[model samples]
Target chain A: SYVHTEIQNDALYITLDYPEKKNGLDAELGTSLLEAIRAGNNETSIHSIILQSKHRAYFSSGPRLEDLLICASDQSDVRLREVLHVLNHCVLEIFTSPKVTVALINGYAYGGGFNMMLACDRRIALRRAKFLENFHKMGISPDLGASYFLPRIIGYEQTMNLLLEGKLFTSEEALRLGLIQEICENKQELQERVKNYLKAVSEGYVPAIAATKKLLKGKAAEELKQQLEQETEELVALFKQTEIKKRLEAL
Target chain B: LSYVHTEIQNDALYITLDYPEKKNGLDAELGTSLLEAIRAGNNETSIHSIILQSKHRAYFSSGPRLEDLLICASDQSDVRLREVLHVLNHCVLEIFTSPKVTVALINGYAYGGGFNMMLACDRRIALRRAKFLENFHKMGISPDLGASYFLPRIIGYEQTMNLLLEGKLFTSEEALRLGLIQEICENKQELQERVKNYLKAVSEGYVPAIAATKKLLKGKAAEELKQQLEQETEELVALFKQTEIKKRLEAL
Candidate 1:
């Protein structure tokens, strides 16, 4: 279940290696990725962290829908709340991590997978990579800080339009909207280009860049407080869902 | 000419819409005079602020000629109306974000473009007789003094929509209640005095202070604040070492 992690030239590269399932984040894989991130964060020698997948077909295709369906199947309120709690904390932690996180996206990042990449500081992808905010398409509201980050990056109304309408924006469209920084030609070029960028950033002798990151982290803390208050209230009503309740019992 | 430009005591620039001739209706001359007055104000460092008011007791009414709108309707008008909007927008943005502070002292009716213009300033002080409206929708036009951003942001969406869509004209008393104006003064003289004291107190800190506060608050996006402050700090430090800043401080 563990993915391959390699350290090279003061940069940590972690890849989600389960190509058979298109690298979807099942519970085990999610924990592995989260741990790798934590490991990268603590590595003093590592100046940058590059996150990617082992396969070209997928960039962690999010929580498998079947797992979610089963997790929320039972009427067990406790189980449902627990799953949401785990997701809530994971989302916030990744977003505010001190390290300069970059996602070298090559393929599809759907639903929560896409939101995970959005948490990164910069994202570079191949032209073939597809990003989807597949929340409303699955008849659920957006979570994982997507609602908060999307609105701030895009306007509030436009984010609402995409979330409510479940639009699939192209890579070109995403660049135009300031979503991702660039789209590279292919995987090898994408890797080289990202390495060059990481190297350049490493050369800039500034105060830990982490100090500046801390300041932005402070802003996110305020937003996180607001989100927790809002989300808790909203989730109370959502938890009463007969379908959601029934699904959790099965899990 | 429907506009008047008069510099009051203490170098305060007063540009008034003076067309009780048509209840302060805006015409070509008014627009030209208004632009010229703003240009003068911008050019003069001694004149720190501009107070847009009404000449007659009636205040400012509707915006530019409807003929101008008809001309721009087809996109054929290559003339200066579009440029006027650009100029006015730039001036408003400048004044809103300018190092020099500005205040709008509204005495009477401020409708259409007049009202939109007031929305551009840092503060608005009004007299009890003042009335304001966003009357553009009545002409099938949308609110423009960057009103789309300012109105809903200040007054919330429901209130902004009601005013824009319903064409509801509200008095200064109601406006004060809605937190639109800083305060309603008794008369034009009192309004002028109040604004002078306010501006003096507010602008006591120089451009450096103003720039720092703006960057901390409204100017930077939340995530950009730290990086922005780093750049701003570097720039300000460099600026302070410049001869121009040194000379000004010495003169002061």
Candidate 2:
């Protein structure tokens, strides 16, 4: 239930710490993350926001299967819709915030978790970290700006294949595709790299970078909200499909 | 009679062109066939993906027949070529917005309007020997068949200009590097096997998700392509009515 936000050296580290689900983000954690981002945005001393994880195995494991099952079973429930609504704002905040946004992916990032990584302006990862997007496998389209941020990061065709295929791609492929900007060799290297990134980004000279990011991302960013709305509608429709129940059970 | 063949296997619809009258040519009749076939797939609830390919050995589809353009070159008011362009524009836009996943399996050489149709698909696969060229400029025309709309989305504007302005016949290697086709096979047998295998693998995922993903990915382009097709048709017809452009088409 807790997402720890620690102010360290002009960078606000928003750690995803939902332990029971290994950081499987639900609406409460999403709200916590969203509040932390806003806190960093309002704090004049903070120049960068770092999204990291307290879980050892995953930066985030994505949506909980139990929650997904609940959403799929109960058509009248507003829980899943609200969860997506909260998560969408969190991702958009990270994407559009004037403060530099960095995602520290120390472990496997899956589905909506990896989708969040794409929203950040810069992503740092460990070489051993794995990535998977299983939305298609789960009988739904992606959300949390998966369709929005990915095509802009990589081109359209490649990103389409990734979502449709729903395979576990290696970190090497992520690096080659420019999904993650830097890959750290070890935990020590990751620490130093994060520090170095903080020194470079949070040293009161980030507005120049922020201005360029805004100009570059303006077109894609404008339509993200509308895009997410459709993603949500389509996802709920898919979640209601009868065959999807069997598919999820098989999993 | 239609020049395009339609067959459904598993969850995918296969639409192949084998225009015996004029191989490697995309005429009004074939364009009509393509439009009908693609619409057929979209209407079928069971069909989740549509694959566009050529049954030809040497070419996918290229320019329309010389006689069709000849009528246009001679008659100032003739809409023979204009009508073909209209049908082709509708056909490409149909694929662009189709709820089903659209794929272009480049079996042979692709050029002009034919190449643009390939670009309109959601995924493009080809044989390594297959080639692509964009020579819409040969007739003093801008690109058509939804080229203007799809090119910039797949590649950057500078690369789009390279295809439009330079109009070179690029090899599959160059096209793959340029992010034109998603996968290129070594030969015909391998290409066929891979197409079926790929479709089967895709169907293994929830077909509903596949359809939803296509709609989400192409939602914006659906509106833009309709307008882009209109613009392409208008500019192309105006060019055809020009004496200089008519002469260029006649010579080609």
Candidate 3:
């Protein structure tokens, strides 16, 4: 199974389970993840949802570069756009859902994986966890709400530093920069902290929390979707170039 | 003479609050003078950055004159108060939307509208002994001057809520932890040196790139924040009509 779900203690836990691929988000896995999130949102018993990865080394490597290379070789950009559409929908679903959402980053989260963590309400990471937005290295602008969310989460200078430099940062730096909420030394500590946080959130008035979130979120989902579509269109156009194709093949 | 003083030096515009007798408390005339100074700075093409400072050693600004606000509350019309707030909001929006980088040189305590003005700037550098407070709650009113819009965006929701609800004074250390100010210097000489070096760096390469990036970032939420600011104005107007605020002012 690419995506696994479990309901316990009034919460839904969704795990990315493609360990062999290092949880790389291909089209199939992306669709499955979206469906799982939808199911969790529709379920009345679930007051919160936590997204984690079953893999030990990488939370997710983001969109499969190999698949994109093949698609670009065939000149069929439609399939890649479909994958991005699903992934963008997944981000929007998690962001707008009434249920509290948390991303537990147990390992490296790069590219789309980093954006996914941003879409969640809160992020808890292990001390060893690293985040990278290497879209520039791949010769493409960030897709799936990276540009839309990064500046809002961190300020403009830091956002530009990460996007332009394409560097990896530890969880400690991430916490200091407001990218993630908390960092723990190990899985045990992460679990304890997330449990305490979830308990506190669940004990609070859920409706009040939801209302505050909605107010703070404002009416940006439609604009975000438009930006995502534009990003995909530009990225696809860039993929047709020989230089980008060479870079993709080298990857 | 106006309480606001403006000078141009080293490709930067320095606007200093010169009303030391009252700790540079914002009054109607002071607000107008500040707005004028900001406009002048924005219009000057040679100026690459604007630095807001205070001549007073005790406080950056104690914010809008409480006595004036008390008189407005007693009047209960809110017409004069609304005009002043609208001007203040315009000043904040100008600061936030300016193409040139804006910096707040916080030498002392900044409260209420003064604190919100610092929030509007692109960066803030403060002395080690500086403090910040959001005193709207104590006055029985909601925030104006784009505080509601900018505070949550800069500092996140929970901390903004705690600050607004409790109306506590935060030290320079806490302000640094909250990412409110970019730097804190130990002494006046250090503060001056840091400001000069920061302006030099910003004037070198931060202008073109920062302007474009800020344009893109602000474009995403400018409309929504404008709406929130309008809502804030309406809420403050409504609160002024209530007797609770009047009673609070009487107690003060």
Candidate 4:
């Protein structure tokens, strides 16, 4: 299964199950995850949607470069835009959904995976989890609403520093930088914290939490949409180049 | 009635709006002098900060004097409001483009143009009782002097909309909560004390870091400000020409 989902404790647990590839974001994985997230969004019993991975070491190693190779085949980005559309929608779902979204990372996240964790309303992670922006080195701008989201979260200067430097960051650094709310020592502690978070979230009225989210969002929904649109356009154009193709192969 | 007072105190430049009549009303001349004062402050080799405050205790500014609006309505039947927005926006640009840190010392209420100027500064510290009001709509106009640009970006859209549309007066506590201002002092004496302490703290830092970070955080820098100021000027001028807007302001 590309994605496995469970409903319990008034939460929808969507676990990435593509372990062989370390749950890379590909067209197939994106579609399945999108569908599962939507299903979770529609289910009335789900108070929160927490994304995890069955992989022991990597939450997701970001996009599969081999999948990107096919995107520029026949000199067209038709499939490229299609895949990006699906991926961005998955991010949009996590971002704008009424149900609170969390990225419960017990493992590493990089590039798009790292950006996905950012899309969540809250992030709780294991101390050993590594995160790499990786996009600048790979010759692509950060995508999936990251450009819009990071500046507001960490301020413009720090966002530029991360993107320009393109460095790997640890969960401890993430916590210190306000990237994640809580850090855990092990998977055991991670799961325990998720339950505590859910209990705290469930105590609040659902509509109240949802309404407050909307208020905080303010004009961000419109801004994120514009950023996503620009990112896809830029990424598709960059992928059509021979240099980026070689870079993708090298990665 | 038309003056800007500039003084150097402990390596900082203080520019006080000294026109007590019309509640420290801002006109083209005052705006020009304010811009010059900012330039003078930047040119001062030892000055590390520029502070804006008001001579009027109860009012920072009542915005444009009623006579200024009358001239716009009567001056050859041409609504010429660009003169005020133009000179004042240049003052805003002078502050925004400066390397030295800019601070607004809101000792009293800031309305319309004065309030917008306060936002353009790097830091805003106010007296506890100092109220902020958006007085543009009172004269049947939209926000000018970069309020529309700065307000929504700082306070978020809902708060900005509420202030501009309902003509609500926000207290210093409200401003602080909204991130409109940095710190609030209990009274006029405390306001000066706070400003002095802040200047001391700023001097204790590697002052060059303040200059560099301000430029970095500004991102698009003066381009956005230039566009917004031009945009506000053109739009406000267009609205001023409309007869209905004139009739509405005339009634005021």
TM-scores computed on chain B for all candidates: 0.70, 0.93, 0.94, 0.92
TM-score of 4: 0.57
Residue B225 displacement (Å), model 1: 8.6
Q: Would you give me the overall lDDT of model 1?
A: 0.62
| Predictions: Cα RMSD each | 18.4, 1.8, 7.8, 10.5
Which residue segments of model 3 deviate by more than 4 Å? Answer: A1-146, A155-172, A175-221, A228-251, B43-48, B154-165, B204-206
* Recovered fraction of real interface contacts per model: 0.00, 0.62, 0.04, 0.02
**Candidate 3 vs candidate 4: which has greater DockQ?**
3
Q: Which numbered prediction scores highest in TM-score against the true structure?
A: 2
Provide the lowest-lDDT 10-residue window in model 2 chain B. B63-72
Encode model 4's per-residue lDDT on B1-252: one tens digit a residue.
448999999889989888865567878878888889999987877877888888877877777766787677556543356667778888888888776768888888887777777777877888888888776666777777787788888878998887777778879898888778877888887777777876775554333334433444464647898899898888877777777666776776
- lDDT (10s digit) by residue, model 1, range B1-252: 335666755655776666655565554555556666766765666655667777667665655445544444434333444455555554445555544456777778777666665665667888888887765433433345455545645664334534544466888888787667778988878876787687677646565565566656556432342343343233323333334433333332
- Return the top candidate by lDDT: 2
What ranking emerges by TM-score with the best candidate at the front?
A: 2, 3, 4, 1
lDDT tens digits, residues B76-125, model 3?
47789888877887788778777677888898999888778778787788
Q: Which of candidates 1 and 2 reaches a greater DockQ?
A: 2
lDDT of 3 by residue, A27-76 (tens): 78889999999998888766899999888888888777887787667677
TM-score of 1: 0.52
Say which docking band candidate 3 falls in. incorrect
The true-versus-predicted C-alpha distance at residue A28 of model 2, in Å, is: 1.9
> Model 2: clashing residue pairs?
none
